[PDB]
Amino acid sequence: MQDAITSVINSADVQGKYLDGSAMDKLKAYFTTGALRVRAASTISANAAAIVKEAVAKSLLYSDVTRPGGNMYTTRRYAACIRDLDYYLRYATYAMLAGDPSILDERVLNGLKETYNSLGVPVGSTVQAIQAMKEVTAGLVGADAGREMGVYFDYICSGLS
Amino acid sequence: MQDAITSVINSADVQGKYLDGSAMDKLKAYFTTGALRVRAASTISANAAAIVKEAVAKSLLYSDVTRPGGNMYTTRRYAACIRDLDYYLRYATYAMLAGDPSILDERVLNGLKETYNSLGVPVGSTVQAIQAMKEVTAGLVGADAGREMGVYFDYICSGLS
Amino acid sequence: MQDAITSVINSADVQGKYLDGSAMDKLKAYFTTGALRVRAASTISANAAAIVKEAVAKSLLYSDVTRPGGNMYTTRRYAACIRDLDYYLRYATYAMLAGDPSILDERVLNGLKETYNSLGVPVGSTVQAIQAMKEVTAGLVGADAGREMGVYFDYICSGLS
Amino acid sequence: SIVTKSIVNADAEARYLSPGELDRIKAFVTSGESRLRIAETLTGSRERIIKSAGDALFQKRPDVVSPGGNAYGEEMTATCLRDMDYYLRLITYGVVAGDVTPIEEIGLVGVREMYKSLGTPVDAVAQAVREMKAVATGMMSGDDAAEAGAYFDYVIGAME
Amino acid sequence: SIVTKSIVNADAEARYLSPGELDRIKAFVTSGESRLRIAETLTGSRERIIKSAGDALFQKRPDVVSPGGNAYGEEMTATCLRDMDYYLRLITYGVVAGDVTPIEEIGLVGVREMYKSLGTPVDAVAQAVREMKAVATGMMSGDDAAEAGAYFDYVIGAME
């Protein structure tokens, strides 16, 4: 768990060197993008349940997975699916605020593949659900904030696949 | 590796007893079902490649596993998948002829889970492939021969899962 | 076993996509560094035995491991130690030429820890020997070729530890 | 690739790379620019290659599209053009890598067993790659057509 | 079911089944015939139950079928009839099992979270199960209507 600042400090410390001009430039880049990160995080905190339910309405609804035999069939499985998608959106917001995806592979992508493979959860359908969540939130917060959200959404989909 | 006859003899020998009436009745049951077992084995030996390719055409074709990134992607992986399904059908035929699933956990289900878990082979997709193979061969040989094939197909799917 | 080119092609193929601009940039980076890789590989092929014997003269000589009771004591053990260090230098040269450490964990680091733990080989002393080999070859081929050798030497030491 | 093959061939022999193998890697490293140009030529015009090669194939071998053949119908002809697209993609990979270990190591090992299990005539697939080679070497300069036709030649040779 | 609940309740207590629990299982085993008769009554006439209950629901709560209602546009009403069919199926499961652990353990745990994520008023769903209960207990004898209305009662109680 480290943001862009802590990773820059960790690189300069593992070097043992002081903060040179490249580290200063990286921190200036983060300190310019931080206000946009803050406003996108507020806008995403506004519409958590709406983004999640629009992602299910785009991908998972009216397909086979909500029908009998699907892994999203029962009300318990539906509630756990909404819970999993809320987790993905919340941690993508955290990784957007930090500017570093270390929290994603520390706390989402750690044992997620083995959990989903033990439960029988389809990984492709949940990857499509995360992609639709990314599409909806990029329609919500704009072009560049949607892109800096979608880089961590693509990180979650890549670590899941 | 033992059929119904050898397992009955092994039970009566581990007892140390002679063959009483219950063993005689079990062997009479096997000697009544044996002709149906023979005819179903001939009918399955007729259509090995057709049953295998219809099982892939039902389950695994046009899904994500034959697309890039899937474990059935390359031609080497496709050929090894056809080889694995031919193994499952051949050993299910052997266990149908013997009337005892001892050959299945002796020679298929022995290190199969650990092999598939080390390779990265999806176990649920191959369980669905074996289930479609069972459905196709039960459509081929009829109701009761399909049932006595499906009990060993379900044995393979249960030991794989 | 795959170089930078084969890993880029494998990523673009598992995607199923064509080679986009990021893959072109990665291959341009490898095609710029390849001449330096070639010259460093020739310079390392020049002085195999000298680098190995200077690594033993730096770390393992005149310590307890060449004395009685050490695991490098006998002439058989000394010859096997020189053989193991020649293996580490040769495979580090191969991984430097490929630009990918897949050969190291495919063909060196596969059962090496369990072999060394079964034989009684000290892993810390051989890690120090590989580190001195890295220091000597980085003194031999220069700064940046020594760094791109030392990344695979550190890969071998990390997989061994 | 070339570097993988040289590294492995020196690796079994317990030796370093010989200097002849090293200038082999050096010459491949210098010719990578022309390899990337051939790859862009093959990549950018894949639509016309697949379309014209499918047209010339079904003109040449009409029985596989006639009722009774494998590629009969809409989706079967689409899957046939998809298999041709797969082989053109592997041709591009083998052009970039400088060797046929991408092509062989992806789509040529169990090709007989796979197309035997699908019910496909493999000679008609060899004719499909032949028409792809004709359209592709009709699209380039002379040495570029020879260098691409080497890998097309390897695919048709590995069919039969 | 009853046997699962008795086994688990003796299982946490590290004891065997008490004789009172055993005659509970015995009485449920004897009443299984009447349970299967109620299940056939509920199963065979599911079309009229779902149709008449949907009619009485949309008569009672017209705003969900009205513009701006969650169930708007033929498929929204029709889609709702599928959810009502799901709940009647769970009612049949709970009638056979002798307890509400099928109904609760399948379709009542996260029902609030699901119907809040869909945008559905849960009181109108409770009215749907109320009309289903009215049509179903209008279809049986007295004790059969009481035994089925117990599980219908549990579903409407677990809604609110």
Binding site: A57, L61 | R67 | - | E47, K51, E74, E75, T77, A78 | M76
Partner: peptide
């Protein structure tokens, strides 16, 4: 209006369908 029919999914790279439209135009 929220039609309940199953959501359309764009074809993934390498899909058989991708070459459906050209196969319809071809011989």
């Amino acid at each position: 209006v929220r039609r309940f029919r199953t959501p359309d999914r764009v074809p993934q790279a390498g899909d058989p369908a991708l070459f459906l439209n050209m196969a319809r135009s071809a011989q």
